[PDB]
């Protein structure tokens, strides 16, 4: 059978450079193109380009031409993806996957590497800016926006009636998450609704009272 | 030039037959081979159909690939759905030797009745605006299947830059929640009058709107 094996995770600082490798086995390396495909967090599969392991011709997708460089060594049956001057935009699971016949024959199935996680993060402990979400029904929904923090651990608790706590979003190596609470429209703003935001990594609790406009 | 078009959500009960479709646009579907990739949440993708309709070893014959010249489309069909078939499915084909991929479809195997999203749009805080930033927040709760297309309008101009949505995530009750964030400057917030968040779920759009 056929195996594509990839380098470990790269947890890097922005501006660094990485070379992810792809070792192949169980087939003549030169019979099938090697394709590179990335997956940003919670995104679909993005195609980056392919290596013609027979001609040595390298094709890059539009958006990946410049800082991304393909190479191979036929002697070790290994393809390579080099990424130069890393940005937080680049953080993704980067995938090796075997392409189509470079000769006249089938069995051109897409075998995937296990994937290779590339994180580019300052890793810099940042407390969250915490802002109130009030509106402009018998029920009324309030919220706390927890914007631009690192790392991932935060808890949100309410005092005033059910709570929804949204999973965090990664943008430019910083995290943003939201929490909402639905109360009876009689209990707000007549009575006080306050969220407490805990960020253990920076040792900061902040309370934000939700005021009407 | 060639794009491959997929719907974002297909669903069916256990035992039922569903088919994921992938319309070719700007090239004939039969000019080039079609592959199907399954990715289960957590794991890496594997080939499931290759060369249009062929199964790799250990893919059950109830997974099935077809092409239709009339509608310029290929289809993945899965008979007698099991839980394991819950996954993202991508079609792949070639243009000028290069790969083209569909945006992916989520096949949901239904373990509970459909649930339309509850949607709330929040304006920015005045606190936030004093830092030359304005983040609108669109909360989305209690939807199944867990696939949602979010579209921001500002005075009837669709926003293509400044919006990000979270991947949908399970609640206690195995329904899904998501949040979309439109980020503007304060001076951009003050410029425009009306802001829409449109959330599309199983081909039905519910939109929340507000004025500055």
């Amino acid at each position: 059978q056929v195996h594509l094996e990839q380098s470990g995770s790269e947890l890097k600082k922005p501006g660094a450079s990485v070379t992810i490798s792809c070792k192949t086995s169980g087939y003549n390396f030169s019979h099938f193109a090697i394709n590179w495909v990335r997956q940003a967090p919670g995104q679909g599969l993005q195609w980056m380009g392919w290596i013609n392991t027979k001609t040595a011709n390298l094709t890059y997708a539009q958006t990946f031409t410049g800082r991304f460089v393909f190479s191979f060594d036929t002697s070790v049956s290994t393809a390579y993806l080099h990424i130069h001057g890393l940005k937080t935009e680049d953080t993704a699971m980067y995938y090796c996957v075997r392409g189509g016949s470079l000769g006249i024959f089938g069995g051109s199935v897409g075998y995937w590497g296990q994937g290779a996680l590339v994180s580019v993060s300052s890793a810099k402990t940042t407390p969250p800016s915490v802002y109130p979400l009030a509106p402009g029904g018998s029920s009324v929904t309030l919220g706390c926006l927890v914007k631009g923090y690192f790392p991932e651990s935060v808890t949100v608790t309410w005092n005033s009636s059910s709570v929804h706590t949204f999973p965090a979003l990664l943008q430019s190596g910083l995290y943003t998450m939201s929490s909402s609470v639905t109360v009876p429209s009689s209990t707000w703003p007549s009575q006080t609704v306050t969220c407490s935001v805990a960020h253990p990594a920076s040792s900061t609790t902040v309370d934000k009272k939700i005021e009407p406009r | 030039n060639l794009t491959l078009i997929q719907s974002r959500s297909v669903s069916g009960s256990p035992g039922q037959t569903v088919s994921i479709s992938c319309t070719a646009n700007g090239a004939h579907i039969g000019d080039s081979y079609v592959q199907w990739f399954q990715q289960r949440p957590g794991s890496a993708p594997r080939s499931v159909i290759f060369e249009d309709d062929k199964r790799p070893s250990g893919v059950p014959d109830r997974l099935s690939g077809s092409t239709d010249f009339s509608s310029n489309s290929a289809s993945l069909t899965i008979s007698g759905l099991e839980s394991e078939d819950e996954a993202d499915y991508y079609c792949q084909s070639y243009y000028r030797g290069d790969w083209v991929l569909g945006g992916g479809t989520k096949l949901t195997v239904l373990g509970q009745p459909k649930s339309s999203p509850s949607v709330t749009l929040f304006p920015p805080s005045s606190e936030e605006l004093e830092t030359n930033k304005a983040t609108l927040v669109c909360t989305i709760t209690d939807f199944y299947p867990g696939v949602v297309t979010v579209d921001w309008k500002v005075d009837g101009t669709p926003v293509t830059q400044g919006m990000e949505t979270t991947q949908p995530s399970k609640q206690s009750n195995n329904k899904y929640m998501a949040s979309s964030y439109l980020t503007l400057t304060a001076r951009a917030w003050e410029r425009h009058s009306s802001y829409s968040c449109q959330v599309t779920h199983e081909g039905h759009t519910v939109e929340k709107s507000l004025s500055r």
Partner: peptide
């Protein structure tokens, strides 16, 4: 015959 990756039936 075919000399382009993916160009066939």
């Amino acid at each position: 015959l075919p000399g382009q990756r993916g160009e066939r039936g």
